[PDB]
Every structure is written in C-alpha cells, then in structure tokens.
Symmetry: C2
Subunit: 370 residues, 2 copies
C-alpha cells in the first residue's frame, strides 16, 4: 500500500538507492516528466521562475517554489520552501544546497532544467560535479509498476473507443486538419481523458507516404488510403494508436500492402517476450516486410517505449541489443510507405507482463473500407 | 520589402546592433519563442538533440541541427550544419564557436536552452562569459512591427467569431470541461487558425471567483455567471479574450458587479496612449473598482503583453513605470472576484498604433443573458 495516487515514495527510494550506487549524493529535478514521476503532479509556466526539487541521498524531497504555486504543494509530503517576488530565490537555494550537499560531490541535474535558471545559480553549481539525470532515472521509468501499466491500458481503452465512433461518420470531402480536430475533440469527450498525448495526425492519399507528415488542407476523397495516428493521456500516461483505412473499395496493391503490414505487425507483437532482444522483435516485422520485397520502404523503427512521454525507452530498433523485461511498455508500429502513391502503418501499444507481450490497444486491425 | 513571411533579416540586424551596443559579441538561440522571432519557424521535440542557432556580431545565422530536420531548413538563408546520429554534434559546435568567437568574450544564451545540452557543451561554454538573452531581446519583441500587429488582429478576429457562434448553442447542463473543449474545437475550425494560444478556461458559478481556475466537471446551470477565456494563434502570434455571461436573468448584484467591471475595462482601454505609464492605465481600472468599494476583490494586474508567447512585456501592473510606446501589444483584463459567489472578468487585446490604443478584440462587451 501507499498514500499517494501511485507509489511515489517507493520511486524516490528506488531512485535514491540507484543514484547512490552509481556514486551520486543527490539530484535536482525541474518541472517536467521526472517531476511528474516522483510526485504525481507537474507545475506549468515556470518560465524563468525557480521551481526546483532537491532529492538528498536519504530522507525525502524539498520543493523550493514560487509563492504563487501554494495550493499545488499543500499536501506535499516533504519540505516546501515558498519564495515571494520580493525575495531572491537563489539565496534560499544556496543555503539549502550548502546545508545539504558536502561540496565537490557529484549531483544529478534534470536535463529539462532551463539554462536561464542554471545561470543565476552558477555560484552554487560551480561548487559541484554536475551530471545529467537521464542515464540514471530512465532505468527506473522504463520498468513500469502495476499502477502505471493500468494508466497505459486505461489510455489505450479511450483511444480504442475513439476509433469505433470515428469511423461511423463521413470522412469524404473533409480535410486532414478538420478530421484531426474531430479526433482531438472525441478523445477529450471520453470519461477519464486527461488530454491528448500529442496532436492527432491524419494522412490521406500520397500524403500517407511520409511518416512524419503533419495534417494539411487536403480533402479526403474516394480512392484515398487514410492513416489515423492519435493518443490520449490517462493520469499522465500516454497511448499511441495508428490505424489505416480506405475510401471506396481498395485498389488491389492497397490490399496487398496492407495485408503485409497486418501480418508483420501481429507477428512482431507475438515475438515479444521477457528475455528477447529489442532488435530481434524489430527483425521480425522487418524480415516479413523484406521477404515480400518492401524492405527498402519500411523506413523507421518498429517501435518506441511509452510512458509519461510519448517517446521513451525501450526502442524496438535494428541496432538495439537491450533485452526486453517485465514492465517495459512500447509500440509495435511497422509500416510501408510508397512515395506519391500511399502509406500503411498499424500501431498498437504493448506491455510486457508476466513474461509475454500484452496488447493494450485492441481496435479492429483488419482493413475497413468506407 | 523582405523575402521572408515577415522581416527576419531586419530583426537579426536590429538584434545584432542591440546586443553589440550592450557589449556582447554574439548570441546562441535554442528552439522556442526567440527562434520563431528570428526565423519564422520552430522545430519540435529536440529533447536532448542539439539544435542551436549562432548569431555572430556581423553576417547572418548558422543552424547546427539534426539531419532529421533537413526539410525544415531547406530554404534557410544562412549556413545549415547537419549532424547524423553517427556523429558528435558538440565537436562540430566547438569548431564553429572557436572559429567564430574570440574567447573570453560575452555571449548571450537562450533562457530556454536545456541544461542537458548546456552540460555536453561545457568545454566550449567554460571559455566564455555567458548571459541570459531575455533582457536584451525582449526590448525588441515588445515593439511589434506592422506584420506582427496584423497577425495579432487576425488572431483576435478568429476569437471574436468563436464568441458569436459559441453563445448560440445550449450551455445549460454541460460541464466546464466539455464547453472548454467545444471552444477549442471551434477555434480550430476557423480559417487561418493555427492552433490555440492556450487551452480554453471555463469557470461557472462560484468557480468563477478563482482567476487561475482550471475547468472542472461542474455542470452549468440556470443561475451561474460563466466566464470564458480563450485564445488563438495566427502565424504564431497570440490572442486572449475573456467574456462573462449569465444563465437566466442576472440576480441583481450580478448586474452591478458586471457594470462596474464593464466601466473599468473600457475606461482603462481609453487611457491607453503613447507616453503614459503602464501603472497609470492600471490605476484607471483599479481606481474605478476601488471607488465602488471592490478594490480588495480585484486581485491581479490589469494586463500583460502578448506576442509569440501569451505572457510577455509590457505589464499593466500597479508597480510598473515603463512608458507605453507604439507597437506594444497587451491585454486590458480587469476583474472582480467574490469567493463562493461568482466572478466577472472582461478581456480585450489592445495595440498601441499611431499614439492611441486600438482594440484588436471587439466581441460584444455588454452582459448577455442566456
């Protein structure tokens, strides 16, 4: 059990034990993803306003924050140190550092801390050996607990329901922009839907050939293969689903390309188990697309991890030799992209639980005609 | 005339001349608002991926960017220096710095540059005297050119049209969350609407008493005073409109509170002229609310500047003695907030052009009953 929405204390300790083993005495966390990880909330718009968390080697956190964020920290299990605009926060921060960290020791610094804040606090930081937090904390975040996995599943359920309601309306004659905005709306009208993971991507026709396409003014017409890729956040955790359809009966190569991606995706997912290397899962979807002769058109990773961010560890990519372990959560999203013609991607979110890969997203993966 | 969508070259030069006078030899710009200012675009998701702009004292910009951002820089009038994942960008960055800046000279650093990038480049930065860019560049951004003022007006027009279509539907029985999401949608279905400035705020009933309220699950009912506050971006530039209504005939103190805010807002706007201090404009709306006895309930600045960000210079606040000048763009948004009862705010966007204050937003400012 734990008093927090999730178990933040168990993360703080795991983090402390972890950074302590690698030879660090403490960590400084700025608002962002790791702030969310350790506390469950994240403060917004702290431009050049000092909002920092000090994590000592033993004990709990201290927040030094602007007086204006008082209600956000009311129930914080730790030291809150408020500063008014008539005060110099960096004086307060120095005292805290000098009174906490020996001097000349190794500290971790949040990669997302603004340089602007770094500079004012140069007098303090000059005294220590500073290292990025990401190589340390990411080891923790890539292994999700049962509550996190439940947030992920919950975020995938919202996104599945959005798929079945969205394909029930008319898409013909409306634009990528308008459709993407219908999706956004629809996500935010599902119970439990925090917000979007990222702004919805709609790629129609030849536009679908570019993986990083941003939705344009192009109208959707009979003949288009139309890729939808969207996500939701649930308690801060992200889903990411891509499905691909057709307006009017599919023209023949469309059916073949699709079927190939369909087979590659579902077999890649089947490979997923504890103990197997990331690349071998990539090799599965890759081999299958290459075997049919399209290897030169599958132009990206099979997948990427999901979490508090949309892109995190682990990466299901050609090179990677990281063995997959229980708790890892990631996407399996192979695709085939034909310049000037069309594209097909199929994306599910997957979780490694009790040694085998579970599909968190489950929306119909067979080719629907519209 | 100018080749860019706006005049970026004239900003680079104004910036170079400005930072040069204050004794700096160059500036380093990370993706964000100032990047947009100087170039017209902004790259997204450059987590710990080095994407930096070097502005020397004379000449034009250099972009050092990830190979993956190639299309974004295709038409860049300057040096583009691409780096692959099989390359070390900080080696490339050192050479560029060593070959550009004398050493031991004063450089400007973007306040939004991540610390993570700062650290890898410590070998380089250790050699120079580093200062935040904001005190220098903000002097430029607070004075808008005619193209910028036109983006602002265009962003205010979209938001006015959203007001008249939104009050034509039923609000009763629907929640702050759902309404805020109807607004978001509606903004994005107007021609020219980039995106939102910020996510729409809907505050019904006693909820309206808190200025920084975030929309909740509370249903809107006959009897509520309902504040809507939303914005749009046009070519990257932001609007911000607040209007306030009532469901069913207003209950009497509601009419009085409103009328008072209505009078304060429009008179504050009338004060706006070149040559007058920011605080005196604040004193105008403040005095008027105090005169009727509500001074202790008007709990924030009259306004704040608008631009590429939603909050920038100038600030229409009690203390500020900055004289207002042509080109400044800002909000005039006084309010009265009654704990547990209700709130009323009226927000317009204003531009100082040819010595007098122009209202960019114009949606009906009188109390509508629903």
């Amino acid at each position: 059990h734990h008093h927090g929405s999730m178990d933040y204390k168990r993360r703080i300790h795991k983090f402390q034990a972890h950074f302590g083993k690698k030879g660090f005495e403490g960590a400084l966390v700025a608002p962002g993803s790791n702030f969310y990880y350790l506390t469950g909330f994240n403060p917004l718009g702290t431009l050049e306003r000092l909002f920092v968390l000090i994590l000592p080697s033993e004990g709990l956190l201290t927040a030094i924050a602007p007086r204006l964020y008082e209600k956000e920290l009311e129930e914080f299990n730790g030291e809150v140190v408020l500063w008014s605009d008539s005060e110099n926060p960096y004086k307060i921060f120095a005292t805290k550092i000098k009174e906490t960290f020996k001097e000349g020791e190794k500290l971790l610094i949040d990669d997302t801390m603004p340089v602007g804040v770094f500079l004012k606090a140069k007098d303090i930081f000059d005294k220590y050996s500073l290292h990025p937090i990401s190589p340390v904390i990411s080891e923790l975040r890539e292994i999700k607990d049962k509550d996190e996995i439940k947030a992920h599943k919950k975020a995938a359920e919202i996104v599945d329901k959005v798929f079945y309601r969205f394909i029930e309306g008319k898409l013909e004659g409306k634009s990528e922009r308008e459709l993407a905005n219908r999706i956004e709306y629809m996500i935010k009208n599902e119970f439990g839907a925090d917000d979007v993971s990222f702004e919805p991507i709609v790629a129609s026709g030849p536009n679908g050939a570019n993986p990083h396409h941003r939705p344009s003014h192009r109208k959707i017409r009979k003949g288009d293969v139309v890729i939808f890729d969207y996500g939701a956040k649930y308690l801060g955790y992200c889903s990411d689903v891509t499905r691909t359809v057709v307006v009017g009966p599919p023209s023949e190569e469309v059916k073949k390309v699709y079927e190939i991606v369909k087979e590659a995706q579902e077999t890649a997912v089947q490979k997923v188990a504890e103990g197997i290397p990331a690349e071998v899962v990539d090799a599965t979807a890759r081999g299958i697309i290459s075997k049919y002769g399209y290897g030169e058109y599958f132009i990206h990773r099979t997948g990427h991890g999901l979490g508090i961010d949309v892109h995190e560890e682990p990466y299901i990519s050609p090179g990677n030799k990281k063995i997959l372990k229980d708790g890892m959560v990631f996407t399996i999203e192979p695709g085939i992209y034909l310049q000037g013609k069309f594209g097909v991607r199929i994306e599910d979110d997957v979780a490694l639980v009790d040694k085998k890969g579970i599909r968190l997203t489950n929306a119909d993966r067979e080719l629907i005609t519209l």
